[PDB]
């Protein structure tokens, strides 16, 4: 008898056919323009999208004008519009069935950094997110797989302790200045 | 099914249990004689002692004599054949040493050209054959 | 077909048989689109217009297109009523 949680779940899933051409080509493509580390991240994204589409499937299985269906649907569309994968005008119950992986991957933090113009490349955006240079509503964020809400989108800025947006220079510029003043005299 | 009455369940359950009894894999997996005839006793691996080195012949057109080991397992005590898997690995084993044996992977049946042999050799002298073949670890004296 | 807005969305609608009320597919090459001309009431001359029917393949293959077009003419009134 211990005070333990013992709760966990798999986040990704493996496909049935390992060796193939087509789905390999689209996942290698989306890693190409979206800058992902490995196949496990898009496997997690596909599993999450499969879960939400399955939940939408038994939600739409139940009949119209049912209380729990209406409540669960209103909460689900409110979550989907507050994360920003939908838009505020198109609130319909069956349009959850018509979205794909790029809508899930659009609200990634790397895509927001790359499209906000404070990064050169998506690889540069990934290495700069991993190096803790961004404050989001005055909070230092490190994780690249970060979901940005719609209301928390205009507060993306460089962290105040980073040398890029204003602050102390790091180890390397201090080393170059020290060796320059050492070699000057 | 064919017996399609509304109150027909016991006859259908009896027919289903007798027909599932009339099978091969279920009778293999739900009888004690099949597991009793297994020299592993339902275990994945076993430990035994090398007692001789045997070079057995091959089948039709594939013709290459294969070198196998008769191993007596410690836990039950019967002479069980085992095949040295990889090239250059028979010189790594000697007489009266302990060998961790396992099957080839086709559920206790003969695999490939080698006749009558269903077990292979994984570990000898508490070191893997892969480490001795690659040269990562040396065979202790 | 229609939709929620209600406009036409199918590419076409197939014609139906006048005897069995069954549609004619694209690869049913035994169907017939033959025309029946009508006569003038006063003289019996050709007035110029026509009216047609449609039969499916399987009725011809089983062998009853003739009495089917006979009852179609009976409902039309082109053939005599006493027959």
């Amino acid at each position: 008898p211990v005070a333990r949680s013992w709760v966990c779940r798999k986040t990704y899933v493996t496909p049935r056919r390992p060796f193939e051409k087509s789905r390999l080509d689209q996942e290698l493509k989306l890693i190409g323009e979206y800058g992902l580390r490995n196949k496990r991240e898009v496997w997690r994204v596909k599993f999450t999208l499969a879960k939400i589409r399955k939940a939408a499937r038994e939600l739409l299985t139940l009949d119209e004008k049912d209380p729990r269906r209406l409540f669960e649907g209103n909460a689900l569309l409110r979550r989907l519009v507050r994360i920003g994968v939908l838009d505020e005008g198109k609130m319909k119950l069956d349009y959850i069935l018509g979205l794909k992986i790029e809508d899930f991957l659009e609200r990634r933090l790397q895509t927001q950094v790359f499209k906000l113009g404070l990064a050169k490349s998506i690889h540069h955006a990934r290495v700069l997110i991993r190096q803790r240079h961004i404050r989001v509503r005055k909070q230092v964020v490190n994780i690249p797989s970060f979901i940005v809400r719609l209301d928390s989108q205009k507060h993306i800025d460089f962290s105040l302790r980073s040398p890029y947006g204003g602050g102390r220079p790091g180890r390397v510029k201090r080393k170059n200045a020290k060796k320059g003043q050492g070699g000057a005299g | 099914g064919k017996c399609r009455g509304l109150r027909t369940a016991r006859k259908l359950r009896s027919h289903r249990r007798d027909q599932k009894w009339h099978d091969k894999q279920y009778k293999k997996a739900h009888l004690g004689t099949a597991l009793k005839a297994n020299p592993f006793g339902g275990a994945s691996h076993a430990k035994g002692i090398v007692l001789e080195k045997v070079g057995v012949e091959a089948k039709q057109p594939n013709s290459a004599i294969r070198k196998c080991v008769r191993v007596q397992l410690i836990k039950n005590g019967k002479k069980i054949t085992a095949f040295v898997p990889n090239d250059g690995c028979l010189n790594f084993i000697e007489e009266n040493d302990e060998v961790l044996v396992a099957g080839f992977g086709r559920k206790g049946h003969a695999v490939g050209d080698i006749p009558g042999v269903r077990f292979k050799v994984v570990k000898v002298a508490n070191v893997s054959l892969l480490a001795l073949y690659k040269g990562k670890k040396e065979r202790p004296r | 077909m229609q939709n929620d807005a209600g406009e036409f969305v199918d590419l076409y609608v197939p014609r139906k048989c006048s005897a069995s009320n069954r549609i004619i597919g694209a690869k049913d090459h035994a169907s017939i689109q033959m025309n029946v001309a009508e006569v003038d009431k006063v003289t019996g001359r050709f007035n110029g217009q026509f009216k047609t029917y449609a039969i499916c393949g399987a009725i011809r293959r089983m062998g009853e297109s003739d009495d089917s077009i006979l009852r179609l003419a009976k409902a039309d009134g082109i053939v005599s009523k006493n027959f």
Binding site: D94 | - | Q2, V13, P14, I23, G25, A26, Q33, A54
Partner: protein, 221 residues
């Protein structure tokens, strides 16, 4: 280089008086002239070869190896075809197969799943095809689900244009010809299944020879 029509359908198409092959599908005329499809279905027509399976008959003068060519054809908007050609060397087999697939193209009807909203995406009902010992089920699926089947009927259902479907297979599916023809007359059966929407009493327009019978008898010999 210039095309010379021999069939009166080809003359009617070349005389700029047949607007589409859609009315030809409506009136179900046979096609034995394989460039009306080239005239109407232009650069959107897509080609993909299935598998080349050699056949032979045992003789006294040695084993001769005739080749069978398997192919699928069709744009991403409906019409889809299949063609089997038997010849000796590969190139004339491939050319004859794509020609005979261009002969036998059928259009398909796209339906909905649950709600009739937006553009149609799936099959309207459950249709099947029967040849040899192959049973191929066509069950409608919701939006964006994807085709779950063997790889060859995934390829066939993207050639047909059905993005979302549910399938089932039975029998010896190793033979590609019987299975492919079973899928083909399964997806060609999406018309011949009467729905309550088609309950309106049809009206027959003029036969395609009847509008321009004078033009065809003065420009066709």
């Amino acid at each position: 280089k210039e095309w010379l029509p021999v069939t009166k359908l080809g003359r009617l198409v070349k005389d700029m008086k047949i607007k589409s092959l859609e009315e030809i599908y409506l009136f179900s005329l046979p096609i034995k002239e394989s460039e009306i499809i080239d005239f109407f279905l232009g650069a959107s027509l897509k080609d993909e070869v299935l598998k080349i399976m050699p056949v032979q008959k045992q003789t006294r003068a040695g084993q001769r190896t005739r080749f069978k060519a398997f192919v699928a054809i069709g744009d991403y908007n409906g019409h889809v075809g299949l063609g089997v050609k038997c010849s000796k060397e590969v190139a004339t087999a491939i050319r004859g197969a794509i020609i005979l697939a261009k002969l036998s193209i059928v259009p398909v009807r796209r339906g909905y799943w649950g709600n009739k909203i937006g553009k149609p995406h799936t099959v309207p009902c459950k249709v099947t095809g029967r040849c040899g010992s192959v049973l191929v089920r066509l069950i409608p699926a919701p939006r964006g689900t994807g085709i779950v089947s063997a790889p060859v009927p995934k390829k066939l259902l993207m050639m047909a244009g059905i993005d979302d479907c549910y399938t089932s297979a039975r029998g010896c599916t190793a033979t590609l010809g019987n299975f492919a023809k079973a899928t083909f007359d399964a997806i060609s059966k999406t018309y011949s299944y009467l729905t309550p929407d088609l309950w309106k009493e049809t009206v027959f327009t003029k036969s395609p020879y009847q509008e321009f019978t004078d033009h065809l008898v003065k420009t066709h010999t």
